[PDB]
Amino acid sequence: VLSEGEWQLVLHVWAKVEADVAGHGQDILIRLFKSHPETLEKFDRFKHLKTEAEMKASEDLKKHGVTVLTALGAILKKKGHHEAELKPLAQSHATKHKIPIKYLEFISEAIIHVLHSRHPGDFGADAQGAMNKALELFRKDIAAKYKELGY
Ligand code: HEM
Numbered sequence: 001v002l003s004e005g006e007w008q009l010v011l012h013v014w015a016k017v018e019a020d021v022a023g024h025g026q027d028i029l030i031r032l033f034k035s036h037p038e039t040l041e042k043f044d045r046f047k048h049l050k051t052e053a054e055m056k057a058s059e060d061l062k063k064h065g066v067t068v069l070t071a072l073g074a075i076l077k078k079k080g081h082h083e084a085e086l087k088p089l090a091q092s093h094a095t096k097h098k099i100p101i102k103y104l105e106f107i108s109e110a111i112i113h114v115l116h117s118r119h120p121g122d123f124g125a126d127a128q129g130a131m132n133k134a135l136e137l138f139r140k141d142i143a144a145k146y147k148e149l150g151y
Pocket of ligand 1: 040
């Protein structure tokens with residue numbers, strides 16, 4: 001469980017993210033797709049993209065980054081009490097989109113990297129550690145729902 005001090009670190013950097021949700025979502029998805037090309041393939045919307053420049057030029061990719069980061073921000077602000085927010089997400093991701101937990105680990109890495117690049121002064125090691133714990137908690141809870149569903 002995260003402590004109150006850890007949640008404060010998480011939400012302090014997250015408030016910086018929310019000044020530019022779309023730009024952060026672009027950066028995160030591009031990093032994910034470049035670092036882990038199998039993830040791109042899960043998106044019929046995006047698997048035509050062949051280059052970073054094409055990814056950066058795609059308005060639809062920017063829209064999905066907003067969708068993803070909006071959902072994550074709503075989860076983070078629940079400070080662990082995110083059961084209702086995870087139910088639909090775990091269901092769609094296990095049974096429709098088919099996103100392994102490992103791919104959630106990869107996007108978590110991408111989130112952390114982009115937050116460190118964009119917000120170094122608010123993303124020292126303490127805050128990195130807290131955000132890693134928050135994203136682990138997310139993954140843990142989704143994983144339990146996947147297991148229930150046999151995914
Ligand atoms: C922080 C982690 C993530 C969050 C919060 C998140 C959130 C969302 C949301 C809110 C939606 C739309 C509602 C829904 O279908 O449930 C969605 C759709 C989707 N997401 Fe996730 N997502 C995350 C990670 C990923 C990863 C890592 C992948 C792939 C590697 C992925 C693949 C997809 C796909 C394929 C869709 C459907 C897109 C479409 O065809 O419109 N997501 N996601």
